[PDB]
Amino acid sequence: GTGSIGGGKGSGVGISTGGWVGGSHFSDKYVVTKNTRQFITTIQNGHLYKTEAIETTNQSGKSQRCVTTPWTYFNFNQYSCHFSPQDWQRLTNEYKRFRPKAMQVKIYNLQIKQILSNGADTTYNNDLTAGVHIFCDGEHAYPNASHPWDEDVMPDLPYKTWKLFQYGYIPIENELADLDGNAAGGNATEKALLYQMPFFLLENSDHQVLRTGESTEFTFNFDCEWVNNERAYIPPGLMFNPKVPTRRVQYIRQNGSTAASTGRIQPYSKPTSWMTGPGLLSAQRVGPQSSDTAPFMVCTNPEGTHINTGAAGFGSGFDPPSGCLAPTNLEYKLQWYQTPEGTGNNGNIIANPSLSMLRDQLLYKGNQTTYNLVGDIWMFPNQVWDRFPITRENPIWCKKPRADKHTIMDPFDGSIAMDHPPGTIFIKMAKIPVPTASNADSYLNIYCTGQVSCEIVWEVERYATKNWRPERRHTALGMSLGGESNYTPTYHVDPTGAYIQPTSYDQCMPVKTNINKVL
Amino acid sequence: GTGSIGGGKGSGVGISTGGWVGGSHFSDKYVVTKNTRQFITTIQNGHLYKTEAIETTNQSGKSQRCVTTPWTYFNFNQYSCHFSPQDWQRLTNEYKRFRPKAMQVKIYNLQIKQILSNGADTTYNNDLTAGVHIFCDGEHAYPNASHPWDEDVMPDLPYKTWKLFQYGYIPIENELADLDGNAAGGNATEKALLYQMPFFLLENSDHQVLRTGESTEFTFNFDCEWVNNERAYIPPGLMFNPKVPTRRVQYIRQNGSTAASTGRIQPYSKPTSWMTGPGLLSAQRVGPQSSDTAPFMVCTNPEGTHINTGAAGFGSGFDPPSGCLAPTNLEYKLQWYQTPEGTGNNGNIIANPSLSMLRDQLLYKGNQTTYNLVGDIWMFPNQVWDRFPITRENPIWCKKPRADKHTIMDPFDGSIAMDHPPGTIFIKMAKIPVPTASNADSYLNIYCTGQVSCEIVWEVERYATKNWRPERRHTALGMSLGGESNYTPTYHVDPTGAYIQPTSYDQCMPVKTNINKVL
Amino acid sequence: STGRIQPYSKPTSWMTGPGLLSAQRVGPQSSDTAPFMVCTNPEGTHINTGAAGFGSGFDPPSGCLAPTNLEYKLQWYQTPEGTGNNGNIIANPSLSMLRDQLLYKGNQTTYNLVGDIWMFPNQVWDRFPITRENPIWCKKPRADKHTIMDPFDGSI
Amino acid sequence: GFGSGFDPPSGCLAPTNLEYKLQWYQTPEGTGNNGNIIANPSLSMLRDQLLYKGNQTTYNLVGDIWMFPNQVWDRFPITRENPIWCKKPRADKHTIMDPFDGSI
Amino acid sequence: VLRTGESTEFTFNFDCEWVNNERAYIPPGLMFNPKVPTRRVQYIRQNGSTAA
Amino acid sequence: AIETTNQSGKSQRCVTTPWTYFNFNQYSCHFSPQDWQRLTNEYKRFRPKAMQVKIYNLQIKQILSNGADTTYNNDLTAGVHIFCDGEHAYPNASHPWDEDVMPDLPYKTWKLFQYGYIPIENELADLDGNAAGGNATEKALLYQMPFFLLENSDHQ
Amino acid sequence: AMDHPPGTIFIKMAKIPVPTASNADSYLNIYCTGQVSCEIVWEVERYATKNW
Numbered sequence A, B: 001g002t003g004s005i006g007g008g009k010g011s012g013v014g015i016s017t018g019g020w021v022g023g024s025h026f027s028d029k030y031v032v033t034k035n036t037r038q039f040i041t042t043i044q045n046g047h048l049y050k051t052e053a054i055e056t057t058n059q060s061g062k063s064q065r066c067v068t069t070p071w072t073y074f075n076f077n078q079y080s081c082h083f084s085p086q087d088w089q090r091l092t093n094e095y096k097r098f099r100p101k102a103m104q105v106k107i108y109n110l111q112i113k114q115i116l117s118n119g120a121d122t123t124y125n126n127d128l129t130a131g132v133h134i135f136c137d138g139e140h141a142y143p144n145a146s147h148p149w150d151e152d153v154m155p156d157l158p159y160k161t162w163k164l165f166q167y168g169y170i171p172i173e174n175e176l177a178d179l180d181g182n183a184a185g186g187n188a189t190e191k192a193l194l195y196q197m198p199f200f201l202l203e204n205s206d207h208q209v210l211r212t213g214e215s216t217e218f219t220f221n222f223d224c225e226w227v228n229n230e231r232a233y234i235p236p237g238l239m240f241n242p243k244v245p246t247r248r249v250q251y252i253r254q255n256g257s258t259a260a261s262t263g264r265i266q267p268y269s270k271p272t273s274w275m276t277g278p279g280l281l282s283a284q285r286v287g288p289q290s291s292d293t294a295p296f297m298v299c300t301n302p303e304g305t306h307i308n309t310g311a312a313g314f315g316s317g318f319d320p321p322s323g324c325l326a327p328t329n330l331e332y333k334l335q336w337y338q339t340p341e342g343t344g345n346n347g348n349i350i351a352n353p354s355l356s357m358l359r360d361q362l363l364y365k366g367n368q369t370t371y372n373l374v375g376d377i378w379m380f381p382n383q384v385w386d387r388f389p390i391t392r393e394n395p396i397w398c399k400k401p402r403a404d405k406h407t408i409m410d411p412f413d414g415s416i417a418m419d420h421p422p423g424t425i426f427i428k429m430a431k432i433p434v435p436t437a438s439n440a441d442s443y444l445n446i447y448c449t450g451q452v453s454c455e456i457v458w459e460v461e462r463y464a465t466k467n468w469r470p471e472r473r474h475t476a477l478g479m480s481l482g483g484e485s486n487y488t489p490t491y492h493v494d495p496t497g498a499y500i501q502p503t504s505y506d507q508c509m510p511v512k513t514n515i516n517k518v519l
Numbered sequence C: 001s002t003g004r005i006q007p008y009s010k011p012t013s014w015m016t017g018p019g020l021l022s023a024q025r026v027g028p029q030s031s032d033t034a035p036f037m038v039c040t041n042p043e044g045t046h047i048n049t050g051a052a053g054f055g056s057g058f059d060p061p062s063g064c065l066a067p068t069n070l071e072y073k074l075q076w077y078q079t080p081e082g083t084g085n086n087g088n089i090i091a092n093p094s095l096s097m098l099r100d101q102l103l104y105k106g107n108q109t110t111y112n113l114v115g116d117i118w119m120f121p122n123q124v125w126d127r128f129p130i131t132r133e134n135p136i137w138c139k140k141p142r143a144d145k146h147t148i149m150d151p152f153d154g155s156i
Numbered sequence D: 001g002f003g004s005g006f007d008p009p010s011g012c013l014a015p016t017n018l019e020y021k022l023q024w025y026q027t028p029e030g031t032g033n034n035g036n037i038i039a040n041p042s043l044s045m046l047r048d049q050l051l052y053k054g055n056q057t058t059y060n061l062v063g064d065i066w067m068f069p070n071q072v073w074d075r076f077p078i079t080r081e082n083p084i085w086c087k088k089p090r091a092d093k094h095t096i097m098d099p100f101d102g103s104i
Numbered sequence E: 001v002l003r004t005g006e007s008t009e010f011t012f013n014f015d016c017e018w019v020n021n022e023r024a025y026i027p028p029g030l031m032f033n034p035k036v037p038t039r040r041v042q043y044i045r046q047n048g049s050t051a052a
Numbered sequence F: 001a002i003e004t005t006n007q008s009g010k011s012q013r014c015v016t017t018p019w020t021y022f023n024f025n026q027y028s029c030h031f032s033p034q035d036w037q038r039l040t041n042e043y044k045r046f047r048p049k050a051m052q053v054k055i056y057n058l059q060i061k062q063i064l065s066n067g068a069d070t071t072y073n074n075d076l077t078a079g080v081h082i083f084c085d086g087e088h089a090y091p092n093a094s095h096p097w098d099e100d101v102m103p104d105l106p107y108k109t110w111k112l113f114q115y116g117y118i119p120i121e122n123e124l125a126d127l128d129g130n131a132a133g134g135n136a137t138e139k140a141l142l143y144q145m146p147f148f149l150l151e152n153s154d155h156q
Numbered sequence G: 001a002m003d004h005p006p007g008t009i010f011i012k013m014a015k016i017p018v019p020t021a022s023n024a025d026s027y028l029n030i031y032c033t034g035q036v037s038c039e040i041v042w043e044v045e046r047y048a049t050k051n052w
Helices: A085-094 A189-195 B085-094 B189-195 F033-042 F137-143
Strands: A004-006 A023-026 A030-042 A050-053 A065-074 A095-118 A121-126 A132-137 A161-163 A165-169 A208-210 A216-221 A249-252 A261-264 A296-298 A316-318 A335-337 A348-350 A364-366 A371-373 A397-399 A416-418 A424-429 A446-462 B023-026 B030-042 B050-053 B065-074 B095-118 B121-126 B132-137 B161-163 B165-169 B208-210 B216-221 B249-252 B261-264 B296-300 B316-318 B335-337 B348-350 B364-366 B371-373 B397-399 B416-418 B424-429 B446-462 C036-040 C056-058 C075-077 C088-090 C101-106 C111-113 D023-025 D036-038 D049-054 D059-061 E007-009 F015-022 F043-066 F069-074 F080-085 F113-117 G008-013 G030-046
Touching (some): A030 A424, A085 A446, A424 A446, B085 B446, F033 G030
Parallel strands (some): A397 A416
Antiparallel strands (some): A023 A030, A030 A446, A065 A165, A132 A424, A296 A316, B249 B261, D023 D036, F043 F069, F043 G030
C-alpha cells in the first residue's frame, strides 16, 4: 500500500525529505524495528553556557555544580523506544537471546518557525532560511548527555511529540571544592581541582547545519553481547542425581557434647562447586527523600575524609546494591515510575522475582549450631549468576567508564555496559541575532520541529527445548484494567486519550521468565 | 550425539532395521514431528472372521451387526499423537495456520515371540521364521478401520506401549433387517438388504510379510486445507465506524398504539450483510446413557417409517448439533475423557468458549415487541463462521463419504474432512497352523512387538499483526496440580508414574484463542 | 447424567441431506397440485389461495429424504395413453443408504421426524437413481446466484 | 448491545412489507418521509420470489426459506446510489456470498 | 509524507465478478411448453371425503 | 518427593527414568596406577585431546525365573537404545565424585546406574505451605517445572 | 570446569511388551551386557629444569 511519489527528485521548500517509517519485521535470525517520532526543540539558556553551584547546606540536598548548554540531545536508550508491547511480547516469547546489530537514525522534514508574541496570543510563521545545528558525538569526546533511567527518552507511543531536554554536565565534584571551606585548612587541592576543571563547548567541533529542505542521517554498527532470555529451572547446586551415592566424606568437628563424626555425604545433598553470585545486603538507606539515600555511597575524596556523615556532596549512591542476591527488603528492589507524573505509591513498578534460579541467590554461613545469612558476598571464584531480567521499560546500554582496570561489568539495573554505545545526537537551533542598540544580546525567538526515524536491526536467535511440558509465556491475561471508570486494559488508551501504563512488573514482560534452559 | 553404527550393512537376526526417532524441528515454513512407539499386536478372533448381531431389545441399547476380523490396525489420527504439549504450545502460540504436508511411517525392529503357557507361569521365546502381514489400504477399498474420537490412537507418551485394536466393520444397518420382523409385513426389502450385504476379507489383496529382520515403510503426501489459528476480536457485524452516519432508512410498521415511523438508522448500529452461521439448538438428548442419546438422529429407512420412537437401530446420532452457535446447554458442548478409565464427572473435558467472535453465534428473531432466539438456523447465504477450535486432543481428519452431492464440509467436532486421508495400516500375524488330529483348527500362540515411527512435515506459516497490545498466549500458569498428594503439574508424571491429564479445556491449548486477525 | 458414549452408537459428523416433507398436494387433478408452489409476485401477494396462475409447482419436494407418502414419489406413465393406475411407474427405494434419509429431533422423551430439512453443512446424499426412462439433462437457468444443483427428478 | 442487525432479511423474496425493502436517503439532511428512496420491484422474474406450502386444502406462504438445493435467484438490482463492494470477512467457512443490499 | 509540491499515486487491479444487467421475463418454472403433454403423474392422497 | 520433615534430611524431588548412563569422569578410569605415576613423574602438564568410545559385543539375555533357580537365554532380536547427549539438551546424568564411574580394575564388571534428575527445588514448593501465605509463586514454580523424556530425541 | 564436556551416553534396553489380559503393563525381563572401550589421546608436555 505504498504510493508512487510524484513531483521531481529535486530539493527545497515544498519537498519532503523523508516518509514516516514504523513497525517491526520478525524473522528467525533478525528483527527489524522502525520508529518515527515528531520532535520539538526550543532555545535553551538563552543561547548561553552557564554554570550553577548549589553550595549544599541541604537546601537542594547536596552540593552539585553543573554547566548547562544551549544544546539539546536525542536519547534513544530504552526498549520501549524500539518495541511495541506486542513486538516485545513476541521477542520475549519466541527468542532465547537478542542483540542490536545495526542502527540507522534519520532527522528530516525539519520546520523552523518564528514565535511572534503580541499580547495574549502568539503566532507561528516559517522562517525558511533558519538552520539547525546537528552533530553526533560518536567519539564520546564530550561528556555523555544521557544517563540510564532518565525521562528524556523517546516517547513510547509513536504519535506523541518528543520534547528534547537541555544538555548539561557536571564539570567537577562540587563538595571537593568548598571554596574557602575550612579556614585553618588552607585550601589548595581544592583550588587545584577548580583550576583544572574542564569546560566543554559543542562549538569546538564540526556540525551539520540543516535548513528545512535538508535532512541528515546517522548509522551505527553495534558490536554487542547478547541479552539472554532464558530461565534456570534449578540452581546449579541441584545438578546432581539424588539416587546416586557420592564418594565424598563429611567430617563434622566436635560440637559441645556431640562427638566428632565422619561419614559419607548423603546422596540427596551433594556438595556443589558453584557459589552464590556477588551482592551487598548489609547497608540500609539513609535520610529523607530529599538527599541521596542510597545504601552504599561511592565517594572519591582526595583529601582528609570528613564526608559529613551524610555523604555530603562526596560521591554518588550505588543502587541497587543487592546484585543477584535475593533482596531482603523493598529498598533493594529496582523501582521506577512509568510516568514523569508518578509520585508516591501511584504509578510505581517494583521488580519482582523472575522465578529464575540464577537470581535471588543467598549464602548462609554455618556456625556449629545453625546457618546465618551472609550479608556481603563479594566477587569470589566459581560464582555464576544471571543478569537482572530486563523489561521493555529498562535502559538498553550504559557506557563503560574509560579506566585502566575494571572487574566484570554487569550493571545491576540490567543495562548493557558498552565500550562505544551509539553516539548522542546533539541538536540546537542556530542563534539568530537581532540587531540591538545596546550590547545586550538579543536573539530571534524560534523553535524547530522535525521527524526522527530510528531503525535497528536486531540479531535474534530462537530456542529449541527437549522439555515435554508447556513453558510459561507472557499473555495479555496478566494485564489489568485502568483509566477512568477502569474499563481500559493496560496498553490501550483512556477515553481521555491517556495511555494506560503497566501497574506491575510482569505487565512489563521481563525476560528470563519463560524459556527454560538446562544448566 | 549420533554414534557411528558398527557392523555390516547386511540383514538378518541380530541387525536392527532402524533407530528410534523423536522430537520436533521448528522453522518458519515447516515443522517436522518425529515419533516412535513400541507396539504390541496379538492374535484376534482366533484367526477367524466372525459376525455378531445384537438383536436390539435394549439389551445392548440398539441393533448392531458387526463383522470382526483377525486383523489389527494403526490409528494415527489425533494431534497429541504428533505433538508434545511443549511443541503444541509453540505451534499455537507462534503460527497463524498449519497443515500436514508429507507423512512417512516405518514399521521395523519386529519381534515375534511364541507364547508358552505351562501351568501358572508363561514363557516367551523367539520364533525367528514367523512373519507378520502388513499392508496399507490407501485406496480405501475396505471399510475404514478408524473413526474420529476413538481410543485406539497412538499413545501420547513416547515410552508407553501401543496395543493395537481389532479391526471390524458394520456390514449392514441391522434394524433394517429385522429378519422375520412383522409377520403381516412379508419382509422382502429386508431380505434384499441381507442378500447384498457385503463381506470384506483383507486377504483379498496383496500384503507384505515381514520376518524379524525385515522392515516396511509407507509414505503419504497430504494435499490439505489449512487449520487456522486466529481469533476474531469482533463479530463481522461490528466492522463499521459508529461515528459515521449511514444513508440507510429503517421503517418500523405500526405496532399497536405506536404509529408507523421511518427514520435514519442510528450510526452506532449499522445493518450487516453477514448472517449467523448454521446450527441446530432445538433438539434435546433422549433416554438413558445406555442408548444412543444424540439430540438429532440421522436415519436411513427404505421402508415404512416406524423408528420405534427411540430411533431403534435406525440411524446414528448427530452430535454436537450446535455448529458454530453458542451452546445453550451442556448437552451441546463437545466433551470427552482424557483416559479410557474416565467415568462420570472424573476425567472429562468440556469445550469452553474460545472467545473468538466467529464462534458462539446467535440469531434473534424480532417480533414487534421483542427478540427471541432462533432455534434452528440452517445454511443461509452470507453466513461466515470459524471452525471449532481444535485442541491437541482432537482428531485431525475424517474421511469424506463418497457421495454424489455434499454441502460445505465443516465437521462440528473440528476434524478436517479429507477426500483421501492417510491409508490405514493393517497388521496381523501369520496364522501358524498346529498339526491336529481332528479337523478343528489349532494354531501356534504368538504375538508381535515392533517399533512404528511416524514422521510428518507440517507446512506452517507465522503471523504478523499491527496490533499494539500484547495478545493472549498459552502459558503453563494455566495448568493445575494433580496426582497423589496433588503436587504434580498437568503434563508431568505422578510419583506412581501416572501421567497427569489436563483437567480443563484451556489446558489442552485450543487454537483460535490467541492470535488476532482483523476481519 | 454424564458418561461415555456407547461404542455401538458413535456420533457422526454427517447430516441427513436436504428435503421438504411438510407440504401436501392441493386441489383436484385439474389444477397444479404440487405440494410446494414456487411463485414470483412483484405486487401485493394475493395468490388466490389456490396459487392462481402465480408460480409453478415444485415436485418432488422430498429430495433424498425417505418419502412418507405416495405423493412424494416420482411417478410417470410409460405411454401417452396411460391413465389412472394403468401404465404408471412409481419410483421405489433403491436400497442405497445415501437415499431415503430421515432426521429425527429429540425432545427429552422421544424422537420426532423433522419435516423440513434445509441445506445444512456436512450433508451428503446420492442423486435420485435414474432409470432408462428418465430425462438426461436439464438446462441450468441463467442466474446470478445458485445453490447446489441436484434436480430431484434426477436429470443433470 | 449483543450483536448487530441483519437487514434487509428478505433476500430475493418478495418483500411483504415496507420494513423488508431497502431504503435510504439521498441527502445527509434527509429525515422522515422527505428525501427517502424505497427500492421497488425490478419486474425481473428472478426477484420477488415466493414459496407456498400446500396443506391439503390450500397454499400458505412459507415465511423462512433457507438455502436449499436447486435455488436460483438474481442479485439485488443495484442503482447508481448503491455501494459497489463489501469486504468478505476473513473466516474459515462461508456460504454463498450475495449481500442483500447488492454490494459485491 | 507529502509537502505541497509532492504528489502520490495508488493503483489497484480488480479481480472481480461481474455485476449483471439482465432481466428474466419469466420465472425458471415457466420454461416449459404448455401444449406438450408430460409423462409425469400426480397422486393426490385422500382428502376428507375426496378420494385419493 | 521427600516432603522433608528431616526423615530423609531435606526436601528433594526427583524424577527417575528407565534409562541408565555411562560415567567416564575420573582419572582412575583412564590410568593404571603405573601409568598415573609415570604421568605425574615425567610431565609438567597434560590435557585430554581426543576421545573415542565404542559400545560393542552386545548381549541381550532373557531372564527366566522358575522357582529358586534362574536361567539366561539369548533373545537375538532384542535391541538396546543408545544415544549420546552432546548438546547437553537434557539434565546432566553425572555429578563429580559419584560412585557411578567406570571400574578401576579392567576385569571388574561395570553396572550402570539409573538416570534421574531434580526437576525443581522442592522446598520452594511447600504445596499448601503456610495457610496465610496464599501460595502463588510456589504454584508458579510447579506449573513451569520441566519434564524430560529421552524418547524425545533420536536413538540408535 | 568445561563449557562442553564429553556428552553422556545413555543406554536402556528396548521395552519388550508382553501380551496381557488386563491393561496393566507387563514386559519381558531382559538384561544387556556388552563391552565399552574408551580411548583418549592426551596432549602432554615434559619438563626441563635448571635445578641441580
